[PDB]
Amino acid sequence: MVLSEGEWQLVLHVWAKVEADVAGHGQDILIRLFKSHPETLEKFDRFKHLKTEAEMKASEDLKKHGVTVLTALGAILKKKGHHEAELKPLAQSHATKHKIPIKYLEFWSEAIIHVLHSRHPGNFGADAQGAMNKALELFRKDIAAKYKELGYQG
Ligand code: HEM
Numbered sequence: 001m002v003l004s005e006g007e008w009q010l011v012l013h014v015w016a017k018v019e020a021d022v023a024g025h026g027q028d029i030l031i032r033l034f035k036s037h038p039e040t041l042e043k044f045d046r047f048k049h050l051k052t053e054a055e056m057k058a059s060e061d062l063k064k065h066g067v068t069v070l071t072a073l074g075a076i077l078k079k080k081g082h083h084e085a086e087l088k089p090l091a092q093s094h095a096t097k098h099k100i101p102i103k104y105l106e107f108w109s110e111a112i113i114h115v116l117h118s119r120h121p122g123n124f125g126a127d128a129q130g131a132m133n134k135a136l137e138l139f140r141k142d143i144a145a146k147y148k149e150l151g152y153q154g
Pocket residue numbers: 040041043044045046068069072073089090093094098100104105108
């Protein structure tokens with residue numbers, strides 16, 4: 001699958017807004033993920049102890065990870081499809097070290113879409129959400145292909 005330039009423009013336009021507050025968006029997205037699919041939290045030995053949303057919001061450690069995650073995702077999105085080099089190490093660490101099922105990657109995509117829709121309604125209408133979903137599906141498809149090559153189900 002390939003996104004059109006018009007689709008990439010919609011994706012990068014809303015991403016530019018996300019970049020005005022990377023730490024805040026990182027926090028919102030991770031918390032959304034954990035609240036919607038609590039089982040994902042078990043994969044983070046570093047955050048498994050957090051019991052409430054209040055504790056998550058206060059964790060400087062969780063905020064730091066959110067920044068790291070969004071910065072990596074941003075670098076990938078800006079490649080507009082030419083992300084093979086950036087994807088390799090990420091696929092390897094998540095398949096071999098962290099052991100993240102492809103199913104959890106879908107939950108992740110859901111969380112990002114929910115937060116963008118909540119914080120940027122004006123720049124995240126139907127067309128823009130469709131473009132973002134397509135970009136995230138592209139990423140998931142490529143990561144899934146790499147998982148297989150690396151010897152991990154998904
Ligand atoms: C767009 C998808 C995602 C991106 C871009 C992303 C990115 C990253 C990055 C950059 C790191 C640090 C470097 C590394 O270890 O490779 C990381 C670590 C990690 N990721 Fe992801 N990640 C994604 C999805 C997920 C999901 C869905 C889970 C599980 C629900 C997950 C679990 C982990 C874990 C357990 C670590 C280690 C955290 C620590 O202990 O410091 N990641 N991820």
